[PDB]
Amino acid sequence: NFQKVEKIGEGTYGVVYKARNKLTGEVVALKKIRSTAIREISLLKELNHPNIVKLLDVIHTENKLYLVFEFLHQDLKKFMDASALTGIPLPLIKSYLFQLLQGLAFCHSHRVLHRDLKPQNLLINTEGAIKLADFGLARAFGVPVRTYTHEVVTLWYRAPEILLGCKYYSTAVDIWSLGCIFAEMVTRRALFPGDSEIDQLFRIFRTLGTPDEVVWPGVTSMPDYKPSFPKWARQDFSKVVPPLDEDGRSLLSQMLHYDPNKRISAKAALAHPFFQDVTKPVPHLRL
Ligand SMILES: CC(C)c1cnn2c(NCc3ccccc3)cc(NC[C@H]3CCNC[C@@H]3O)nc12
DSSP: OEEEEEEEEEOSSSEEEEEEETTTOOEEEEEEEOOHHHHHHHHGGGOOOTTBOOEEEEEEETTEEEEEEEOOSEEHHHHHHHTTTTOOOHHHHHHHHHHHHHHHHHHHHTTOOOSOOOGGGEEEOTTSOEEEOSTTHHHHHOOOSBOTTOOBOOOTTOOHHHHTTOSSOOTHHHHHHHHHHHHHHHHSSOSSOOSSHHHHHHHHHHHHOOOOTTTSTTGGGSTTOOTTSOOOOOOOHHHHSTTOOHHHHHHHHHHTOSSTTTSOOHHHHHTSGGGTTOOOOOOOOOO
């Protein structure tokens, strides 16, 4: 049914090809992965939003699960690499953040989490849109330590409650990841580039302060919390994300609250004064 055009990427779970539907003529991204999973994933065919990469079809055959997605011409990680020398202009950053919070707000209203947001999962088009890829896949299959190609699954965007062993992730884990992504677009460097769970957690602690019962009630009771964690002081955001303005720094602070109950929701974030002058700029793309 599908003519492969080219290999475009490697997902957590399987290879992705650009492909053409042989009888509709449609160009699609075809994910090939080598049955609660099938039910859960089938449900995602109905979770449709303009900022969520469209799941067109789920095809289970021959010990393989094919997910047929809408095709987008570039990812944000590539966009960010391509703009390394002047950075993404702030208005486009704000537009992108605003549109991703809409995607989160939508899925979270339906109690679907992503749980593995990262630049690689943010795809863009020539219309100035940005969309979230792989929503719902982590609940269906888990998030493994390595991908199907053995590549290390990045920890850089992982919320602290996950690293401390909380088993019952809330929608707040996506807000944490998206705040790390926001900081990275602004500064052009990963905010917390951990290379192990403990290095990730100590990178967080060194910037935001080691958490305690004062900022995060119940934290000392979490499974992987140790009294022996070093006790680091918090730094000013002014130093973390220059030259983000006061509104942006205030929003980023609320997206990176330790306590998941206090972390801003996607819906409340949409109302933040940072978005008072939000516009939809069209980026420059080399296809
Ligand atoms: C599977 C679906 C989510 C998808 C739609 N467009 N598209 C593009 N397009 C960007 C692109 C186009 C052409 C060449 C390279 C990259 C790349 C890509 N890469 C594999 C992704 C899928 C999601 N997770 C991270 C992986 O890198 N996955 C997708």
